[PDB]
């Protein structure tokens, strides 16, 4: 017999002790080496309830990533709480590695294996593991990058779809590469490339899936209504540099319905900023100009963060806008099938 519980997890990784890359260094001291032969026990005739939106594993990972970023991506100047902090800010080696989260003695992680599991409610096919899969602590807004894919159908995730204040996570079943590049020889200017044939077909499937959740209403996408640049644009870190990419073209209603002309390569305008709003929760940070040469990162778009327009209208359509900003949601998108329980 067991029961739902919360405890202090430990992390595991395949970090290299010789590596100067920031995630490797952190993991060397914070984590233990992974298990060569992991043990998964499928629980027969067992039905468990889950809730990805109230999973405290997310809280611990959040603390870890903040700790990672604070101790590794130090600004030249930190503007926070009326004060000003000037530090050394050397260029770093930056590339997220997979981090496993595991339970100590007396505790075990339960894993939901239902292929269409939406994040909350009962799960029929449950297994028992010590550690989660390898999760890369990728910090981004609007688009979830380099994450896991849904096994079968596209899955809509929300604590409550009828509540316009709750975040919506669209979990894709097919990756769509995003190829972002800052060329060699304005040094702050950059761009991301996406195959519009692949993206629009996926986006069409997203609208159809959303139709199933909102009574066959017309599904419409719009740009963000407002907010800081970190959320009104696709914000992410590539090779230590903070990227801001305009996603207006990524959500083209014209291409997902008269559907002729947008069948090619989509190029999003990006800019590398040295003055940023920190996601860690404080204020503004200042960094050195970008490194020289070719700055490039090819990522998998594996998820989308959305917010739905509220209001006492009466139309037969729902409007969705690229969301994000709550980085805890990023971890929720990978930790959704896990929950900690205590043995007796």
């Amino acid at each position: 017999v067991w029961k739902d519980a919360d405890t202090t997890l430990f992390c595991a990784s395949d970090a290299k002790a010789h590596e100067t890359e920031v995630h490797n260094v952190w993991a060397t001291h914070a984590c233990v080496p992974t298990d060569p032969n992991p043990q998964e026990i499928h629980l027969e005739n067992v039905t468990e309830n889950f809730n990805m939106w109230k999973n405290n594993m997310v809280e611990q990972m959040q603390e870890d990533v903040i700790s990672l970023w604070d101790q590794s991506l130090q600004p030249c100047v930190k503007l926070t709480g009326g004060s000003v902090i000037k530090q050394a800010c050397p260029k770093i080696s930056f590339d997220p590695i997979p981090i496993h989260y595991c339970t100590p003695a007396g505790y075990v992680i339960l894993k939901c294996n239902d292929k269409n599991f939406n994040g909350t409610g009962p799960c029929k096919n449950v297994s028992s593991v010590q550690c989660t899969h390898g999760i890369k602590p990728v910090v981004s807004t609007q688009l979830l990058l380099n994450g896991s894919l849904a096994e079968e159908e596209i899955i809509i995730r929300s604590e409550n779809l009828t509540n316009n204040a709750k975040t919506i996570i669209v979990h894709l079943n097919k990756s769509v590469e995003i190829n972002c590049t800052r060329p060699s020889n304005d040094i702050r200017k950059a761009y991301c490339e996406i195959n519009g044939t692949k993206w629009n077909k996926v986006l069409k499937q997203v609208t159809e899936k959303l139709k199933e959740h909102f009574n066959n209403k017309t599904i419409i996408f719009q740009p963000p209504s407002g907010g800081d640049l970190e959320i009104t644009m696709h914000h992410f870190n590539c090779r230590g540099e903070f990227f801001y990419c305009n996603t207006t073209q990524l959500f083209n209603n014209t291409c997902i319905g008269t559907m002729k002309g947008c069948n090619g390569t989509i190029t999003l305008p990006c800019k590398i900023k040295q003055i940023i709003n920190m996601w860690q929760g404080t204020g503004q940070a200042m960094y050195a100009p970008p490194i020289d040469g070719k700055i490039n990162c090819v990522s998998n778009i594996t998820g989308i963060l959305l917010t739905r327009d509220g209001g006492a209208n009466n139309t037969s359509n729902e409007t969705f806008r690229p969301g994000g900003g709550n980085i805890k949601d990023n971890w929720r998108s990978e930790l959704y099938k896990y929950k900690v329980v205590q043995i007796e």
Binding site: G82, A165, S225, G226, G227, I231, G281, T307, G310, G311
Partner: protein, 228 residues
Amino acid sequence: QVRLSQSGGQMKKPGDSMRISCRASGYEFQNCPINWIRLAPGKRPEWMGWMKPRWGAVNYARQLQGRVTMTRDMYSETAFLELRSLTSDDTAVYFCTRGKYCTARDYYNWDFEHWGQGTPVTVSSASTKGPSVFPLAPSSKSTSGGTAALGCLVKDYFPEPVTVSWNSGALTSGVHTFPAVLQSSGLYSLSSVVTVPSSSLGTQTYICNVNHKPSNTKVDKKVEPKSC
């Protein structure tokens, strides 16, 4: 103790834009969404949108799209509301609100325990229009042995208010002056009535005195039985 304190009331014209502020205190400002709700008598409370201070993320009510803007200043813990292209329909008391449940890890937005004191905003034309005054005639035959009703219909004026007296205030008994109604035209209308002995209809003169200060209008109208 959680507090929300709002800026002062405003008078606006059609076409103007308005900006109001809501200063928060007593809690961690960036942990909870701030909402804007407006109240107008005779209408449903209307949610205009929420704003999350962390990144300034917003969600605007669909029927206000393109007209409204919500921002915040993190240092002063103040939320700001802007509404453009004002019309008469925007006349209301504007409130900022916050949910009852809010922690550093979780919140529920919609149980509004906390309200600002409200910011009244009136949107109206500078123009004024004096009332038309029509008699509400007694009746046909003088039914000696009963009481008769007569009055004045005070129609199509703007803005409020008009007042009505009878016989320069000498007649008060049985006088009823009704609260005005707002018509489809955007102009106001009301009636004032008085019940009098039917046997007095051929002896005593009945005059309603209509006053409308905004248009500098004072009208006297004698109400007498129709001759037929």
